[PDB]
């Protein structure tokens, strides 16, 4: 009855950040030491929880959200941040409680010009944990777009130019955000204790 963190962290394919993936961890024993004791992570920033004190506390649910961004943008996957990713792709709440784990994936998501996407145009900021997969032509002016691309009428999604020879800030990073939900319900996710 072990929690399926391996399916999330070790997935061969990862989602684009605008279409970010969410795994609902429920009814299992999680051992977080596989995570915080590993040496493969470029970034491991937790908020309101310490990953070392988790292995004997119980939660109603855990969410593992995964996607791919670029290194310069990893600092946006945090409470109280702004930027294209935090505003229009993936938004953490200010009261966020959980961990943001990220590692360089240049050896897996760069080829010789892969196809990961981010949302570039949006009229307003995303709500926390909102997922917008719309592809409606973005209207930058007064004229309606009528589903045709043109001046002031832009396709909302853009492709990362992921090339192996990019600077580290333009290289792909895989990101897993764990967030811990403890409603007033049966707690189904526990540490080995």
């Amino acid at each position, epitope marked *: 009855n072990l929690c399926p963190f391996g399916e999330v962290f070790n997935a061969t394919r990862f989602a684009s950040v605008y279409a970010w993936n969410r795994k609902r961890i429920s009814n299992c024993v999680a051992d977080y030491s596989v995570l915080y004791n590993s040496a493969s992570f470029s970034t491991f*920033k937790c908020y309101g929880v310490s990953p070392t004190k988790l292995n004997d506390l119980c939660f109603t649910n855990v969410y593992a959200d995964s996607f791919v961004i670029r290194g310069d943008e990893v600092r946006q996957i945090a409470p109280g941040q702004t930027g294209k990713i935090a505003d229009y792709n993936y938004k953490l709440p200010d009261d966020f409680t959980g961990c943001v784990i990220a590692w360089n994936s240049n050896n897996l998501d760069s080829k010789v010009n892969y196809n990961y996407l981010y949302r570039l145009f949006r009229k307003s900021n995303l709500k926390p944990f909102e997922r917008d997969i719309s592809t409606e032509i973005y209207q930058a002016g007064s004229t309606p777009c009528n589903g045709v691309e043109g001046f002031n009428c832009y396709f909302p999604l853009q492709s990362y130019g992921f090339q192996p020879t990019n600077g580290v800030g333009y290289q792909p990073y895989r990101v897993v955000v764990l967030s811990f939900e403890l409603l007033h319900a049966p707690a189904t996710v526990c540490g080995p204790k």
Partner: antibody, heavy 119, light 114 residues
Framework: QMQLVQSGTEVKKPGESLKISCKGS????????IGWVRQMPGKGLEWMGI????????RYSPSFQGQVTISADKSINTAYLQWSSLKASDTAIYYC????????????WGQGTTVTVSS | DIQLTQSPDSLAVSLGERATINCKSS????????????LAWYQQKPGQPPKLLIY???TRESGVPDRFSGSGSGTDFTLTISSLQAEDVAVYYC?????????FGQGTKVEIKR
């Protein structure tokens, strides 16, 4: 299990600069935020600031903002606390302390670094 | 921002008897989402660094004997040593980590009453 070890005792004159260090070792350091705490002789504990080495995100206390600089080099698992020009009031013991996350209690303490500033 | 006041500043207890230290918060430190008070108790013996005794107001750190217990909620918290022992002579500090900047209590000196 993780452990912090700080640089040695310091005796400096007023006006000199100084940079003391705190090196982490063991398992799980990637998750650790390093704060600094001052204890002036015979007095209590004062939280100065905190840093995440993985990207050098730093948060200062209002009383120490602009008074010191907290830095880090991730390559060697080391955090740094530096003064540009010391005052006699800076005479104290300085502990580095680690919490495995922000808004997390301080699990790991260094042994402390004694700093005397006198002419 | 969030300030903590300890009571009393000094405390003399006979061996085997109970020591009680109070920490009052200037503002509540209870994440309602996770339902935990972000409050810690540290111990410091002369010439040694502080050591974490209790976190989340009432959870004991590993190795800490069961005579230490933390309780309280909202703005009022208590640390209790049920049977004072000579190894417990020290200064005890509460600390909030609800938000940066973190803030410490003034400290409570605890000695043996003979």
């Amino acid at each position: 299990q993780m452990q912090l070890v700080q640089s040695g005792t310091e005796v400096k004159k007023p006006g000199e600069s100084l940079k003391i260090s705190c090196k982490g070792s063991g398992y799980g350091f990637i998750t650790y935020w390093i704060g600094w705490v001052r204890q002036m002789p015979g007095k209590g504990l004062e939280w100065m600031g905190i840093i995440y080495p993985g990207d050098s995100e730093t948060r200062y206390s209002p009383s120490f903002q602009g008074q010191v600089t907290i830095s880090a080099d991730k390559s060697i698992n080391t955090a740094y606390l530096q003064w540009s020009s010391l005052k006699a009031s800076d005479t104290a013991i300085y502990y580095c302390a680690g919490g495995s996350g922000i808004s997390t209690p301080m699990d790991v303490w260094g042994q402390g670094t004694t700093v005397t500033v006198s002419s | 921002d969030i300030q903590l006041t300890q009571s009393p500043d000094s405390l003399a207890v006979s061996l085997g008897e109970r020591a009680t230290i109070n920490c009052k918060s200037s503002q509540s430190v209870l994440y309602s989402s996770i339902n935990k008070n972000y409050l810690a108790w540290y111990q410091q013996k002369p010439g040694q660094p502080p050591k974490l005794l209790i976190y989340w107001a009432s959870t004991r750190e590993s190795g800490v004997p069961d005579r230490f217990s933390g309780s309280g909620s909202g703005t009022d918290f208590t640390l209790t040593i049920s049977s004072l022992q000579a190894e417990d002579v020290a200064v005890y500090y509460c600390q909030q980590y609800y938000s940066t900047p973190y803030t410490f209590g003034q400290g409570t000196k605890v000695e043996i009453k003979r």
